[PDB]
Amino acid sequence: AGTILLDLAPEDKEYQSVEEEMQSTIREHRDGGNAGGIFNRYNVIRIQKVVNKKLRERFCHRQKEVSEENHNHHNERMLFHGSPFINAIIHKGFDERHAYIGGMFGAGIYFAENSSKSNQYVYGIGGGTGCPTHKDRSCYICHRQMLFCRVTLGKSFLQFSTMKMAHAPPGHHSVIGRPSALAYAEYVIYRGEQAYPEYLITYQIMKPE
Numbered sequence: 001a002g003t004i005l006l007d008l009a010p011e012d013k014e015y016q017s018v019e020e021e022m023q024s025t026i027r028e029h030r031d032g033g034n035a036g037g038i039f040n041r042y043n044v045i046r047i048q049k050v051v052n053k054k055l056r057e058r059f060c061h062r063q064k065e066v067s068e069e070n071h072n073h074h075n076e077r078m079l080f081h082g083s084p085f086i087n088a089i090i091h092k093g094f095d096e097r098h099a100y101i102g103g104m105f106g107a108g109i110y111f112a113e114n115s116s117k118s119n120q121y122v123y124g125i126g127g128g129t130g131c132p133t134h135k136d137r138s139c140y141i142c143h144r145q146m147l148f149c150r151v152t153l154g155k156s157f158l159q160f161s162t163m164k165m166a167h168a169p170p171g172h173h174s175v176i177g178r179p180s181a182l183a184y185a186e187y188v189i190y191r192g193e194q195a196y197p198e199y200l201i202t203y204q205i206m207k208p209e
C-alpha cells in the first residue's frame with residue numbers, strides 16, 4: 001500500500017529517455033484534438049519513479065508465471081497509460097475489475113505506444129468534461145499526468161479489427177490492435193498484475209503559437 005515517488009533529475013539520462021519516448025511518439029489524432037486538445041509538444045514538469053513493495057511483488061510473481069507459460073520469455077514492453085484514476089493505480093495497482101468495458105477488444109486494461117493516444121483518456125473516456133478546474137479538454141494551465149508502464153505481454157494475440165473478449169485467447173496473455181483501419185497500435189491486458197506503473201509523468205500540453 002505504501003508508495004514512494006522518487007524524483008528523477010532533468011539531467012539524468014533515465015529522465016531524458018522517458019521524455020524522449022513521450023515527445024517523439026506524439027501523433028496527429030483523427031478527432032481533431034477533441035479528447036486530448038490541440039498540441040504538438042509537451043511541457044514535462046516532473047518525472048517520478050513509483051516504488052511500492054506489494055505492487056512490485058504482484059507484478060514480479062505474474063511475470064514469472066507468464067515467462068514459464070511462454071518459453072521463459074515474459075515479453076515486457078514500456079507503454080503509456082492515461083486514466084483519471086492515476087492515484088489509485090500508483091497506490092492500489094492496476095485492477096482488471098476497472099477494465100475499459102467500452103473498448104474494441106472488450107474489458108481489458110489498455111496501453112498505447114504513442115503518448116498522445118493516452119492523453120485522450122487522462123480526463124476519462126473521450127477526454128470526459130476535461131480539467132476539473134476549467135472544464136477544458138484542451139486546458140494548457142492544468143498539470144496533467146500519465147504513466148509510462150512496464151507491461152507483461154507474454155504471447156500477444158494480434159487483432160486488426162474490433163473483437164470483444166473478456167480475457168486473452170487460450171494460450172495467450174495479451175491482445176494487440178494493429179494499425180491496418182486502426183489509427184495507432186493499442187496494447188490490452190486482462191490482468192492488473194501484468195502492468196507496473198514504473199514512471200509518473202507530470203506535464204502540460206503545449207498551446208501552439
Ligand SMILES: Cn1cc(-c2ccc(-c3nc4c(CO)cccc4c(=O)[nH]3)cc2)cn1
Pocket residue numbers: 080081082083084098099100101103104110111112117118119121124125186187
Ligand atoms: C472504468 N473506467 C475506465 C476508464 C478508462 C481509463 C483509461 C482508458 C485508456 N484507454 C486507452 C485506449 C482505449 O482505446 C487505447 C490506448 C490507450 C489507452 C489508455 O491509456 N487509457 C480507458 C478507459 C474510465 N472509467
Ligand SMILES: [Zn+2]
Pocket residue numbers: 131132133134135136139140141142
Ligand atoms: Zn484547467
